[PDB]
Paper text:
At the heart of the spliceosome is pre-mRNA processing factor 8 (Prp8), a large (approximately 270 kDa) and highly conserved protein. Prp8 helps generate mature mRNA by coordinating critical rearrangements at the catalytic core of the spliceosome. The intein-containing precursor undergoes protein splicing, a process that excises the intein and ligates the flanking sequences, called exteins, to form the functional protein.
The Cne Prp8 intein was solved to 1.75 Å resolution. The Cne Prp8 intein structure represents only the second known fungal nuclear intein structure. As with all solved intein structures so far, the Cne Prp8 intein has the canonical horseshoe shape, created by pseudo–2-fold symmetry that positions the catalytic N- and C termini in close proximity. This catalytic center contains the residues essential for splicing: the nucleophilic cysteine (C1) in Block A, and the terminal asparagine (N171) in Block G. The C1 and N171 are also positioned in the vicinity of the conserved Block B TxxH residues (T62 and H65), which are important for priming the intein for self-excision at its amino terminus. For example, Blocks A and B are far apart in sequence but fold proximally in 3D space to execute protein splicing. This representation also illustrates that the unresolved regions of the intein are between Block B and Block F and likely represent flexible linker sequences of a former endonuclease domain. The unstructured regions in the Cne Prp8 intein structure are where the Sce Vma1 intein encodes a linker domain (dashed red lines). A closer look at the active centers of the Cne Prp8 intein and the Sce Vma1 intein demonstrates unmistakable overlap of the catalytic residues, further confirming the similarities. The Cne Prp8 intein only has 2 cysteines: C1 in Block A, and C61 in Block B, immediately preceding the TxxH motif (blue arrowheads).
Numbering used by the authors: 1 to 73, 90 to 120, 133 to 171
The structure:
């Protein structure tokens, strides 16, 4: 699940804040097709902040949120990993994993991932099909 205020893409290309996503809403998938959201849930807790080397907005999300990544050795394979499991990996293993944006340097290198010191509100939902959808800057996100 994602920090409130995270900007996502509707299926029509306009932006919607994650907490404004409602049941049945259509989001944009990484291949360009529609995704249906359901099971809207909300809570409040200390989230993890992920910062990239590249100048993109931080991703802030719950400890059980699933990151969709590319892992080295094309050149990279698709892997899903929870924030908890990724956080606990040794940094030499972590550097093999990259976030990514949907094509049309699309890999993003994580510079830091840290637990925040105060709780903040988050919103989550499930997405059909491959469970992938787009942030406003085309970062690929998972359920």
């Amino acid at each position: 699940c994602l920090q409130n205020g995270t900007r996502l893409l509707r299926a029509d290309g306009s932006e919607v804040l994650v907490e404004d996503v409602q049941e049945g809403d259509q989001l944009l998938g990484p291949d360009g097709t529609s995704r249906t959201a359901s099971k809207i849930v909300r809570g409040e807790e200390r989230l993890y902040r992920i910062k990239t080397h590249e100048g993109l907005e931080d991703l802030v999300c719950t400890h059980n949120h699933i990151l969709s990544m590319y892992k080295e050795r094309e050149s990279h394979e698709r892997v899903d990993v929870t924030v908890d499991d990724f956080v606990r990996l040794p940094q030499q293993e972590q550097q093999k994993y990259k976030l990514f944006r949907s094509t049309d340097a699309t890999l993003l290198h994580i510079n830091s991932i840290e637990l925040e010191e105060e709780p903040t509100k988050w919103s989550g939902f499930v997405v059909d099909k491959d469970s992938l959808y787009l942030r406003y800057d085309y970062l690929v996100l998972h359920n």
